[model samples]
Target chain A: MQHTYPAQLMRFGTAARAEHMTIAAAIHALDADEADAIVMDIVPDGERDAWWDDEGFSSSVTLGQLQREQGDKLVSKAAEYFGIACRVNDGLRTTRFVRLFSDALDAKPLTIGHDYEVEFLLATRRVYEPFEAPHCDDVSYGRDTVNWPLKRSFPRQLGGFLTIQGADNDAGMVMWDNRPESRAALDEMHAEYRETGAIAALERAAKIMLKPQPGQLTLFQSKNLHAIERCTSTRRTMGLFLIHTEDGWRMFD
Target chain B: MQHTYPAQLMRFGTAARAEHMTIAAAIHALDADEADAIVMDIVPDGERDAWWDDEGFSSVTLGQLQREQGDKLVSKAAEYFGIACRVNDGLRTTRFVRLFSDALDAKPLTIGHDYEVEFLLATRRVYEPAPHCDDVSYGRDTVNWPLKRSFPRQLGGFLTIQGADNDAGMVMWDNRPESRAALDEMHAEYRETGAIAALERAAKIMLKPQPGQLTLFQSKNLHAIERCTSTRRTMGLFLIHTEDGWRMFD
Candidate 1:
């Protein structure tokens, strides 16, 4: 059976206001619900390929192989890009990435509950497969009952993807607003698609298309429904999820 | 070159106390350095085999395969064995048995650790046992990233789930200071060239731990497992002393 979050856990009627902002401003905006989605230019366009090669993404490598070979390097790069110093808590089942958060707003450094490795998303040439269907992160990763109890500790979850290689013809992410009506329409369409094995047409009024250029990072609330557009050429990105905690922000995949 | 811990980290003249204690007391004693080593009876003599089978140790298993196949294996096994288990940070290369401390039950012994079952089958597969140390085995990772430092002082815990019927499967250790230097030279030689020459030591102490008996000793000492004429299986973990506290890992 498909598990989903209750209506209260989801955000509704929130359309993507794709404003470009600095990293710090974008983070503040996301936490304050000032922007539905924000895009930041991380690496310059001319130096994008060099940065991509430096991350060992230019070669054909699986996530397991990449992590095994260059796990420390990947962690270092992620820390540099995110403006945070992180430590890896390696366990038998999963490796948790944690960072200390403290600013002028806080008195002391707090260890945030950041979990999971920085994931590398790769699509080969002429790949027709969509990376994921329209889904909310809360429904995807959160436990239905456990999350309810810890609602005060964890206020919100955010999703972000940094484009290493841009997709062709604006074939990128298609996001739907987090409005009450939009959520109902999404649930109905999803149920029909799951039952009939047919991809339902998204309502044009509620959907926003985000086409991120190379070296650009896009952020959005994870409770919104988002789907990856099928691209004919190769596409690459690094994606992760962040949880807004009472202490600070925690990141995961 | 051998990456030996400095003299401060090395516990000289320390010997195994071998006193039988309850699990809680054992942790306290080990943490306070009151005892170099202590043995505890974890499973009852009669229920040892049943406990072994329950952890999936009656069947053959490798550390990686055992952990991957049963990632939750450590929690249940540690609980049954009277050890407080917690997960900690470490690399993927060294496959050590991990154990943790229960906050309410036992005083925290180590910051982190694991337990692994080693199986030996009696076959004519050129069984050449070498006198080595656990610190070197675990600290040095030739295949992956090198550990920043070898554990300075550590304890080795062994519980024989099953033992070979014959006399061939005993473990031997040398306490003589010079024996460690000799082993170090031999380790460096072996690393330079893939060969290990047997040490000619007459003062070696050999002991065969019975099933259900947990034996603890300083793991940096030179030790070797004699070739088994039959099958022998044992569960073991290593406890290393750090500046923070005692940490256990297989």
Candidate 2:
């Protein structure tokens, strides 16, 4: 028999778009399989600019500097938001947006595993180009020896990104409804994608395109194939993955 | 600490130019780290055309063909190559054994009993100017073959059945102290920007062998096949030094 993802998971219109859902409430809903994704307007319109200028685009605050100065504050904030006692993963660097999420989710634990620092992604066509190919977080992360064994225990993984800055136009995130059943299937799909371009493959697959505004937090099932749309303008976000373990939710890059 | 290959391995002028060195001697020299490569005039000029016509242009990957066409591929390859051929379950490919033992009446090069070989038929339909080591290509295999893990000392030999037209030949580099770093930088640049920088900085040796010639080299050293207008078909295999002796595979 062929293994497959839950029918309701990763379907279109299953994402909950809210302005006031507490981080704890969102996690509960996701845990119960009520929604495949959650998009929340965490930062207020007035506070968004300050958040971007101070943390997102600050020339003085390097990643190392941010980690050394305000790393503990970010960790405590994430712990408070999820109602869990959390600590940063050992030897991992912290990001600026981790602090932002900590502060914004104040309106929202059990003892959870080490929470990794948020990974900052800054992409542009003229400058740095992020991997825009369609892929699943599970298959990509499972390649690592540490994650491989952990995958069997925690099958349901969540990937999330907080948009600090948006492009001038709509350069949305494209996600497919289906997921690969095995590594071989994923490899075959990838080989086909390489031979034929993304446009052709996208045309064949059932997918959805989402364009979240700045200061919005979007969380989705990580097993679905997803890609970032190419854009000329700058697109900045902080991304991370959360795995629900036996103890609680453990987060990592 | 930095891991370095044996100084004598992959060094220039280390390849033996032989008209009659037995396959046993070649294997012995490689196993003892006495020579980096071996080049032999295996097929005579008079018989080179027949070998090329029979198996060089064959349109098949023996493994895939065997799954679809069955044991007929084994008999066909055996008749053409004049060697014992069989399906290798571990490698998931068809391989020829006892390479030149039948014709030369010499002891075959083997780890225990058999010398295994595979056919390589490469066509340069489009140009790839960048240089890369065989290890890079070998690592991309999805089959998880044990041979993929072993590198640097892995021996690779090619018996040229058909030589390509144009200046398209093989370029090889020695394993110097700086070679590893140079290759790493080259691969990084290729990954970041799809273009390879000019290879003018590194010293290299170019080999343009004829149809009857056989060339061998340390597979880990940086090498590139120049763009060819025609197909370059050859019988190729990798020889790995084992505790028992030396084993060969594709």
Candidate 3:
């Protein structure tokens, strides 16, 4: 299906200025659903040889946590405050946040290096990964799973990041700032990403990097690719993965 | 939304033989949301590969229909290979059927320029499922509902799977929003990537074309056919109206 609109990012702010949210506990609890909706990406490590030095993408480091009881409650509240029903990871079946998110919104999966519109993507938890430069929140990270075996039933495209830990964390994302021209450039970068696991091409589009405070959730359609900026530090944040469907909001992984 | 268009038994013994309700089973699978796209091959056995051998193409568009070639094909198709079924919110869905007749194979024609016939008006419902499906088999719980049951949803575009030789046919689509922003977002990419690339990316799950294979798919998903390097292909674009309970030439 050919869509005619450009990509966009919608921000939801609740306790935007307020701070203080559990972080270590969330990561510890997320261990249960650790491999549930994770995207095994092989970031270029150990100099240039890192590309071929296959270390199996990257070992599952303590980057973030999967929300359980407290996290779920906050996400549902956030959705209510904004009047939007986001998809969330529910148990084992609909655990893949990317697939479930897209399904809920009744749209195609995110198309990186090309133009697309985000449907129902879920981001519910606080992440504390190292300031590794080459990383997309979820959409692009899940591209490897975008093959034949996973068709007919998958998740939607989505992203939701909020600042929780330190002020040094700089979250940046690529948006449709320049219409079709910018979109094409981003697509070219997407092509480059496919050819080589390099994030340098992403420089084609200007990024929107900022320090978010508590109660403020940065929500965007997965088509607008995002990643944690290279700030000599780590990012600790809290949010929930919610999906939007004909039946309203649902939990995603 | 789930659709229950009764399983029917159409007697096309004149051109079609046997009593196997493959068409019925196909429609049942579609109703059950077995897959996003389905294909049925009506061509007889041992005749499949021959069509691809002749490096030619021929198509019969509506106005430019060669009476001798066009009339004979449709009239015969209406009787020999035909099955009609009433469906739910028919306006929300579409039906695309093409006939590759002996006439086309006999008299090859250029696809794009020669073919311009509007055969049928198809109403298609849109299905938006997760792009991940481990099961290509069958089940009773997989259909998707992309829009409201009462409103007429916007159609995406045409798709590619089969075409005639000496002819080039393509279906193009524009950007349009559906009931939700997310649905609209998917289309945004559909518009950007073009139908050819979309089909290429979607080839994994899209059903292969087969004779007598009745396929049901979400409306707005466009398809195209390359310049026929083999035999001629005949098909129609049917339009169905929900309000008047009738079929209109769209």
Candidate 4:
């Protein structure tokens, strides 16, 4: 019952890029355009508590007030900051880029009654794994040992370690397909362990810290010039936003 | 301090009105505005519910959303039934006006996680007695002395009487007023019979209503369409709204 195509909706917001982030700064300052932009972004998302709305926490800044007060100065500041010669514009149209992003993300200068949108933005992160798969990858995790070539050949030896952890490190949450010999060599000593919880946890840690994309090159380690390695280290960065944005590009398998 | 001025703040909603009762239709079919208008009119006024608000039950129309939309409308409808109209014209506008009033009154819409704004228009009734002195008048009606009155006097006296009742004409919540003579007569009778509760209640019923405006209206009696036997079978009314709104106009 699968269909090849599906109608879809696009999301509105910024990419982690230089220009987009700079335009975002104007809104973070709470300009009129930014206020309007944010209302749309956060309100429709339904990411709020009951009876929540962002209207007048910091007093309303009507369109007329924005023009008379901060319009020109804001435009000048934006131009100088981005190093682009600015032109006199009217209303939100004056800085269309700032207006667009602010409307979607609700930076600032523009204000709402609640700032739940900002809270969501600051907590976003995603990760992936790049290691090879194990020989029994086709077999699900819970029953992997049954499919091992040697286990079917020698059911007696399988009886001793089949239900144990470290018994088969090769079948844990993540085992490099090419590294099975190394895991098998280690399993000989620690086969007494019954669960791979520790090994699986380590793989989760690796996935959370691996950065396979933009080649700043993780040492898979850190050094003097680099900041102390912490939980949010470069090891976990994938930079998926940049690749997906390209109209037609080859992707890694 | 026996000060002489009227300046009080009330986070009040538009006072309700008792839509006029019709010659043909019963209380259920009174005019929309008149019914609520009269209710707004009769409620005794004073700043006593702590916040100087007419916390009396008034109503407005609401929507029918999942959080039980328009229950306010339903409550109002159950209480009354009449014409329904659009905003720029009728009931809708009143509901909007109520909401605006609610915001002004600092009325909390919702409190807990599950609760929400109980969008009900409030009722307000400001009392201003007809301009006159407490050159008082009172009446009373007991089973023995059905109806009687007292002469104007400086001293306070008690009068006991039966209030208005149901179609069966049984005694109920209604009470008539009376003068010093009537109260004295009843108290003496009670002394003979040794009925303290009856005597005390009679004294309280004999008391007249108070005046916040010093003396605005000098009502002579609490009669119905029957007692206006002369000047005019008329009822006073006032419109109240923003500034010179329905409040100041009549």
Candidate 5:
């Protein structure tokens, strides 16, 4: 039987944004589900290639037992405290710090590229191989790496591994003259970033995620970042990987 | 470097109606930088297969053609005249009239089978292909071959089509039915009853495109039904199509 079908293109703007925020707010409202929601959008700088060498893009973070009060208090402190800079366009106010979460949120299996042509996508999965670049933000690096079969979904357009690594407070995403340890760690991760320009590589020989100087982490989306291969100089044993730099792999419509 | 692409699959609802209405209004207002804002949505229906043999996801109709006084009246006359009898189930409406535009509005194009695959659907564009069954409230046989195509972008979730046959009405979807005799003359078309069935081979051939019908029309993302070749003797033009009863494709 015959039927009418119209062919035209459409752009969804604030209307679509409101729908997502509403979902996030609802999830935040629930006590049992009172878990925090992170609005994950990547602000990008055109440098996205070698940025892939030691790349990765997924993980679950637990509130550090190392922190004084719960990690929430730590997040409230770091970026808001020293005032991190915006990683994408520097010389801008820190404005907001992305708080990290111990738990994971927004996990959906999304395959990349197009369904017809599938083999070419960068791999992703719920569990991530973490690598932290410690400090250096002037130049780009494969700050983090997640291993095979990348399948998790992200919250914003222009998402990728290199995009999340460079952030204020941590690298030069934003810096404060104060914290001695932060400065020291910056020097440490710099010295630490070796082999393949990779500061750290996850041994899929065993997989699972990094270290950061400061800057609140967005709730692991409690999410998204990088890749890494090769060995650590000190430990023949696989090394630790973590989120580094400020947004690099930014994906969009 | 590897990146995660964000995506979502939402089965939109009646907002489709508003969306539909919006598109209609936009096209209307495009010429004028400013005009009364239009608001509308997709018309939702469950009788999916009711229009295109299985389920016609969407369709279009003429909106405001002028009557004698310059006041537009025939635009959607076909739809308004035909849809009510659906309340009768399989029987024809007792008060049904041969709506002038029924032949045009009755046309439909196929999108896909089982509603699974996606691609550029081909059209069966032709004029006065089959007999108009004047029994509105459902898809008309004149439009059985759905033209393949995706939903209009903004209106994605809604499977729809749009247009009329002539210059003045081409942009609109329906028009006052030109007299049937005149209709067949331009391209002899009519409502088929198939006494026993228009579902058989003869009727099928008629429904399929013929050289005469082919040269008579053109379409855009559009499709049409041709005349029935034959029918059952127990009925009218018998050629042994299908046994049992048939339905108005959705």
Candidate 6:
């Protein structure tokens, strides 16, 4: 159920347990938010490599193989939960979906049995401190397909995640609602984007911090200008993106 | 006494008896915070215009004239306390600062009240209401800069009364040596790029303030207001020290 909140915040309920298996274990082990300043001192095994086969490249994940081989129920469950049509628009592609990060062109998938949010984002640079670089989703060319209809449909860019593991503050999400002042700033940002073909600037708005939990689905979007809060070792979230199409709501590449 | 806090948050003590004056009377009478949510829907006069004015614009007082103007005693009390209309580059400048509504006049400000401060605030949006510590104040439209240089000041910098109900709390950082170094590095970067993103990250703790409370900090501390709603009216007397005497810019 979608619940509207003050400050334009919204919430979607949690996913049932038993569905969270290996993903949960790995997140529990990594402990992203609980880890302190010394987290960088240690090295990480290639968590992403295990999630995707070698030929998929950093950007690809072995979606079919993970379902068949690892016995993971998350991908299909996410699709059903979000009610997204899993098939490609052209009807030629068999793969259910592909994922993208706001940054990280070479973004890879999380490990099958031992995944955590940090190790899953192997290609991206590490954020040593939390809130060190709070920002909205980056919508540069090739990375984002800026369609007016899609933007209109998913004004908040609704997405979901499986909190294989969780944290109180570590690896958390930050959100700010579009209050009057923020709404005005967003309008100015939209104007700038329209005038110049550049991603609009970020604005200051009422903000709140939320930590995603395990055995639950973390739902969020960027319309409210969400960000990753300063977190440590104990945080872990894994999931996929959902888009709203004229046909109906469905998964996005 | 001046005590140092992290993120440049500081403290100055309160004022003596008699000198406390009409600002206190107005605040005490209105009880703005304790008022109901329906407070904004109805009316307000002194809310917009002025308290009892001395000349009208330049000098004002929170005397009895405003208290008798309304149906509810609270409304009348609010009018009496919130005297009006002088701003500086800030005019009729009073140190008793309170925040109630969203549509404030300008981008927030930072004052070098007792001493100057520095930090890199890359990516900071002066208008957005996020949990980061930076300064908030009105804009600078006047070329008529008031104070020429930094001068000695008293412990009682200003008196702030939170007359209405609201939540914008003060988020501050600890004054550790490492914290200071981070601020120093931020300042260096600020000089080069003039960005302010990292300043909010410098803050780690938030102090929740009450309506009738009086909390004091050093003059040079760094602080930011968390996002909040409802009527959080405030009144303050921001006093400055120039070569001439202790004056307020309003």
What is candidate 1's CAPRI-style docking category based on DockQ? incorrect
TM-score pick, better of 1 and 4: 1
The predictions' CA RMSDs to the true structure, in order, are: 19.9, 23.3, 23.4, 26.6, 26.4, 26.7
Model 5, B193-216: lDDT tens per residue?
323232222211111111111111
Name the runs in model 4 displaced over 4 angstroms: A1-100, A103-253, B1-63, B66-106, B113-250
User: In model 2, which regions exceed 4 Å deviation?
Assistant: A1-19, A49-96, A99-132, A139-141, A144-153, A198-205, B1-250
Q: Choose the strongest candidate by DockQ.
A: 1
Q: How close is candidate 3 to the true structure, as a TM-score?
A: 0.24
Q: At residue B188, what lDDT does model 5 achieve? A: 29
Candidate 2 recovers what fraction of true contacts?
0.00
TM-score of chain B of each: 0.52, 0.56, 0.31, 0.17, 0.16, 0.32
Q: What are the candidates' individual DockQ scores?
A: 0.03, 0.01, 0.01, 0.02, 0.00, 0.00
Tens digits of per-residue lDDT for model 6, B1-250? 2211112122222121111212222222222221100011111333331321212113222112111211121222112112221022133221222221011121212222322211111110122222111111111111111112332221111212233245565654433222323445656676777765655455344445444333332222444456655444333332232344333322
TM-score of chain A of each: 0.55, 0.61, 0.37, 0.14, 0.18, 0.37
Q: Candidate 3 residues A132-199, lDDT tens each?
A: 32233331121212110112221342344444444354543334322222323554666777788875
Best candidate, TM-score-wise? 1
Candidate 5 lDDT over A138-251, as tens digits, reads: 111111111111223232212112133433323212111111122234445456666346434222222112222111122211121222222122111111112221332221
lDDT of 2 by residue, B53-168 (tens): 44322322322222211122222222212211212221222122334222223222221112232322221122322565544224221232112243446666676766667746
lDDT per residue, candidate 6, A120-218, as tens digits? Answer: 111211222333323333111111122100113234333445344444454666666532223335445567767776533334344455654343444
Model 1 Cα lDDT, one tens digit per residue, A112-205 = 1222122112211113333446766551221222211122323345666667786565578776774322234545667888898754454543
The CAPRI class of candidate 3 is: incorrect
Model with the higher TM-score, candidate 3 or 6:
3
What tens-digit string does per-residue lDDT give for candidate 1 at B1-250? 2111111111234543434334545545555655544555555568766544443221111122122112122212222111111122221111213222331121123211121211111111122225666552231212221123455345666666666667454444444223234555776877887665454543444565666656566665566777776676666655655566545444
